[PDB]
Design a protein around this ligand. Structure first.
Ligand SMILES: N/C(=N/O)c1ccc(F)cc1
Ligand SMILES: N/C(=N/O)c1ccc(F)cc1
Lengths: 115, 115
């Protein structure tokens, strides 16, 4: 609270580390469903169903332009990518499996980097 | 944003300084309408009209128990006291004038202490 602070965590490397993790996500062989935004004019249902579209290239543009105020908000967008994927894809499909794989991939990198 | 911070303002004295200012408010001769919470069972209209009652003793209890996370939230409660006063009192009344006087009194102390 006021004048009562926890010891300051050094966050000076967070931006670089998030960029690193995002690069690993981007280069994963199962990243292809998530690299670019879904074309809302070509994919039936997506615009009405998915209230907050997100993809790696958008995350990258936000990261590169200071639109994440902290670690937590970066992770939220990354997880949003896979939450959307689950909403729109059967688990038993190529894209469904990709999402599950990439989520697991992210969460371990996330833990190994900060936890 | 992430890994981009303004120079750290030293906030270690804010709690003591807010307490000091609150003490000056409390001891002002026109503090009497604001020292204690309005009795909602004895004052017609107040409970239905004033959605967020606030008074100095409540501010003091919050301050003393770490319920203000920062300067801004302390000032918000103080100003709420006088906003409520304006809502429920004619400017041309003793309590109305008290509120205006105490608000001016606060805002100068506030500026002189932090600005
Ligand atoms: N099930 C799909 N197969 O291509 C699919 C196509 C486009 C999408 F945006 C999501 C899923
Ligand atoms: N006008 C008033 N006179 O006592 C007044 C009384 C009680 C209040 F809570 C506010 C105002």
């Amino acid at each position: 609270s006021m004048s009562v602070k926890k010891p300051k965590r050094d966050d000076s490397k967070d931006l670089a580390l998030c960029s690193m993790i995002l690069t690993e996500m981007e280069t994963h062989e199962d990243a292809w469903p998530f690299l670019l935004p879904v074309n809302l004019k070509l994919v039936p249902g997506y615009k009405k169903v998915i209230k907050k579209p997100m993809d790696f290239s958008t995350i990258r543009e936000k990261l590169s332009s200071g639109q994440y105020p902290n670690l937590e908000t970066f992770a939220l967008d990354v997880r949003l990518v896979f939450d959307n994927c689950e909403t729109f894809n059967e688990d038993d499909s190529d894209i469904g499996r990709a999402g599950h794989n990439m989520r697991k991939y992210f969460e371990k990198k996330w833990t190994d980097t900060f936890k």
